[PDB]
Amino acid sequence: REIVHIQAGQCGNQIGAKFWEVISDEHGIDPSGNYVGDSDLQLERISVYYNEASSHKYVPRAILVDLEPGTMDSVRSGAFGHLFRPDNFIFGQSGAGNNWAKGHYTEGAELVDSVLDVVRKECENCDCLQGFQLTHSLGGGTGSGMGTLLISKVREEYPDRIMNTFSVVPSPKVSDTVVEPYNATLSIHQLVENTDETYCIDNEALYDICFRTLKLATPTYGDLNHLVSATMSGVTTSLRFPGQLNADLRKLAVNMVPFPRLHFFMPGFAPLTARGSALTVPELTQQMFDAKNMMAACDPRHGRYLTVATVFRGRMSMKEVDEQMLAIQSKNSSYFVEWIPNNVKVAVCDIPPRGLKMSSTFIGNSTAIQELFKRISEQFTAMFRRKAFLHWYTGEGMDEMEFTEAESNMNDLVSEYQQYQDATAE
Amino acid sequence: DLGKKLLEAARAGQDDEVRILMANGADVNATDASGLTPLHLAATYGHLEIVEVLLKHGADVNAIDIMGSTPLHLAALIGHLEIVEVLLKHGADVNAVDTWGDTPLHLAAIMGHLEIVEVLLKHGADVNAQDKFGKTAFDISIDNGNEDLAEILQK
Amino acid sequence: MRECISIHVGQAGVQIGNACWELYCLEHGIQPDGQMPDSFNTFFSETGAGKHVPRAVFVDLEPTVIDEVRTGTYRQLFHPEQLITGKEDAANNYARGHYTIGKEIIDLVLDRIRKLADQCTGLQGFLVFHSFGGGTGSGFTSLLMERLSVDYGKKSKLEFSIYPAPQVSTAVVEPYNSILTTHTTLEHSDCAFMVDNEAIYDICRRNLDIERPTYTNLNRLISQIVSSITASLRFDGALNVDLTEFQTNLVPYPRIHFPLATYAPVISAEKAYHEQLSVAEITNACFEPANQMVKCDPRHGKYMACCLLYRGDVVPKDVNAAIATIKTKRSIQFVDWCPTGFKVGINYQPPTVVPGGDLAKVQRAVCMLSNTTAIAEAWARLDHKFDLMYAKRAFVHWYVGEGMEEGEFSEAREDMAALEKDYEEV
Ligand SMILES: Nc1nc2c(ncn2[C@@H]2O[C@H](COP(=O)(O)OP(=O)(O)OP(=O)(O)O)[C@@H](O)[C@H]2O)c(=O)[nH]1
Ligand SMILES: Nc1nc2c(ncn2[C@@H]2O[C@H](COP(=O)(O)OP(=O)(O)O)[C@@H](O)[C@H]2O)c(=O)[nH]1
Ligand SMILES: COC(=O)Nc1nc2ccc(C(=O)c3ccccc3)cc2[nH]1
Ligand SMILES: [Cl-]
Ligand SMILES: [Cl-]
Ligand SMILES: [Mg+2]
């Protein structure tokens, strides 16, 4: 039933705040916690993300974490900033300086226990805890370094709970800091072993969408986060609203993850809109299979789909949906592995998102995601070959062979995808 | 030894401690264990004022470490645009190849330093230079779908 | 008067049990509160207040579905202690339903069943409703069947099993669960009536003019067929008067205990003035594949047994004449070691249809239960989907992580291979 949300670091807290603004509006929740909605459907599954306080007040089951005090002040200044439980703000004083080592072994380790005490308090309150949800970047130090430390500590305490992450992947197009490949490679190692699902939210792709499709000369983090919050809203639709699907996180992962290490998804969304600016079902179905709509800078046609889940939101003909979805598979039958029968599934929710009569969200488990990891591995290897900036990490206790291991594990993952990309039914 | 102290002073960016060490005869072209010189380290960590001072006093702009890395390789990898321009102005080999077959254009391409890419091209970067896997800088931009970089490499 | 206890496992079982007991009540003139202004005592106990209470248990590992029974029109009908729910479901994982989560509630389910059996003067056995694809309908059912064979060794056990169809399912692991539960249940079940959701789906579309059938559309049609299969147990007829007789008339060999059901006529409620179909017409429709519960071609197979269960205004002489015509048909080939004959039962009550359903009233209807080798085609389809996924070990880690050994996959698959061979050797 209940989900415990965590958001770590500057990026984690920023996209995490935007997620709560979006689904709160969908559920008709006031910035003070008061429900002021029209429909009863807005409340059926409200307990999944909201604790039901005394005065008919709904309080996000969210924990906010950061070694930087600044980002916490900015959350409260937001529209819904005072909706969060004050005691669920856990922040250090020093900051992470974009150093994965500082977040994972040094400052982060000093603060991780204080964070788990807050997680435990939220958990014991849950009737039947469904899983954990984390938002964070992989290129920084707090979200990447301390986020993955949090995941492994949460995995120890709650081994039988699902752990999904919305992980933002670094791109030179968004932040120029050149240690991000280090931080992301060290983190992806952690995610491969300790998360059940990971949504690859690639800043490369977010920028390209804004810059080339939405024609935004200079995309801001708000332009990028508009795409992220809309994606996260659709990805969690089946959990938050009544409809065909009644599945918990565990059931959603069981049918999407054929292999334990291949749980990194390509999320997509249609239509793509800029902040403040209706498609047919065929135009919706075509768009979300189109490379331009992917939130991970990968071309699906360069790989093969293992599993695909799509959720349509709005009032629309289910039959027309079934036919279009059928139209794509048979037309592109080669891009879907033939050794997982019926691997493309569809769901519909009559309640559309804010400002749209029609929308659809795409969740792909595609071998083409290896293009993302090969891009990071290439940058990682360019820096690591020249040993540039390693002192920042070895000075924080890290061993140098941790870098070789992360690189090695990164490439084993790439090889796994390529293995199943070439396998046949025979 | 004054060479080790000039190396460390150039890494940390201590401008004043560089000229003092150079005032007591510090080897401007001193090498560490891996063959890096003060100019390698100042260019790696964005210390422009030390880069220019070293070049005014006998620094080999095209010195190479054990792995064949020149100062321009490192400045291009890390993204220091001004340092890249100074080095070229003082005769940096725009097409120096290291032990991995990489040229400064390769490393600027890999790391998405588009401004450096353009500068290197304007100074004669070889678009046909192949690394030890056969990739040119344009191959790298196609393989990782970098449309912005590919357009730059085609003009 | 020998009692029968119905057990409904998982969402599919529960929701189909709802439609069945809904229909049972109407056929015996029982109100939703059990009040009534003899024969049906086999399925309904009788209290001192005159309340007729189903001899039924509903079991699910999460409470969403059974909670609607506890608040629907029939909240008064059932024993409340016979509506049993856990809090966390099997996540479409056979292993969860059988090994980890299922074992946390099995003892309670048995004690509640014992309570019902203690009120039986001569318990015949159990009717078990469940899906193949669900983790509860598969894993917990096979666990329940194993435990019932130990505690009720002499009693008979019948299954109504929902065979998976991609058109109305969002799970990809259903082939696994389907073979796993069949393997471990085969030896503990005396007779099993499989319901192919695709067959019910096509019937709802072709005969009932329903473009997008819901689970309610399917279940009302399914319950109409279950009712006609169990009618003999509730109306003191001549044919199949006790559970033991199902096996005698339909199962010449214990492993080949999957009879094919064919029901006719299915007419849309919009055609309230259709010309009534003769006995000969509805009988010939029992040999049209389009009316069968499992999709397969009996013309390829051979009959080992054949029962015709008529309901309504049916004169025995017209049945003998219609069968006389059927025996000339070349498509109907019996095995050489069986009486080439049809066991006939007639229930002169006019068929009942639920108010709110999609079926027109008819004066006469029939259900043919036949044990044909052709149903092995339905096993072949499942076995093939199983083979494609298990060749790459896809999804297997989900099961191994829930108290199951990988060897059980191949052990179950070999059992299926031996079952297909059993059909070939007949
Ligand atoms: N005919 C029919 N089929 C159903 C119904 N509900 C679910 N199914 C089918 O059953 C399969 C899914 O398994 P469920 O029965 O829903 O799962 P479960 O037994 O509750 O076990 P869990 O995995 O723990 O949820 C799919 O093939 C569905 O198409 C129903 O009401 N009627
Ligand atoms: N989309 C998005 N990405 C961000 C945001 N803030 C930082 N990032 C990315 O995250 C990386 C920097 O990590 P950051 O979260 O700032 O470090 P941390 O605070 O220590 O966890 C860079 O790749 C940034 O592009 C944001 O608001 N939105
Ligand atoms: C907080 O973390 C998550 O929300 N994780 C997550 N995983 C998912 C997988 C699938 C879906 C669907 O919408 C769906 C659509 C059609 C058929 C089946 C499922 C939704 C998911 N959400
Ligand atoms: Cl579907
Ligand atoms: Cl006969
Ligand atoms: Mg269920």
Residue numbers in the entry:
A (entry chain B): 2 to 42, 45 to 280, 285 to 360, 369 to 441
B (entry chain F): 13 to 167
C (entry chain A): 1 to 37, 47 to 435
Structure paper excerpt:
We solved the structures of the T2R-TTL-MBZ and T1D-MBZ complexes and the electron densities refined to 2.20 Å and 2.33 Å resolutions, respectively. The βII- and βIII-tubulin isotypes share an overall sequence identity of 91% with a single difference at the MBZ binding site, where residue 241 (helix H7) is a Cys (βII) or a Ser (βIII). We unequivocally found MBZ ligand density in chains B of T1D and T2R-TTL complexes, and at chain D of T2R-TTL the density of the ligand was less defined, which correlated with the presence of partial electron density for the βT7 loop. In both structures, MBZ occupies the central pocket of the colchicine domain, as well as a zone buried deeper in β-tubulin and facing the β-sheet of the nucleotide-binding domain, similarly to the binding mode of NOC showing very similar interactions with β-tubulin, which supports the overall similar binding affinity measured. In our two structures, MBZ occupies zones 2 and 3 and does not contact the α-tubulin T5 loop (which is in a ‘closed’ conformation) and establishes extended interactions with β-tubulin N-terminal (strands S5 and S6) and intermediate (helix H7, H8 and strands S8, S9) domains. However, there are subtle differences specially on the hydrogen bonding interactions. These interactions are established by residues of N167 on S5 and E200 on S6 with the carbamate region (as shown with NOC) and additional residues depending on β-tubulin isotype.
Finally, we further delved into the molecular mechanism of action of Mebendazole by combining biochemical and structural studies to obtain crystallographic high-resolution information of the Mebendazole-tubulin complex, which provided insights into the mechanisms of differential toxicity between helminths and mammalians.
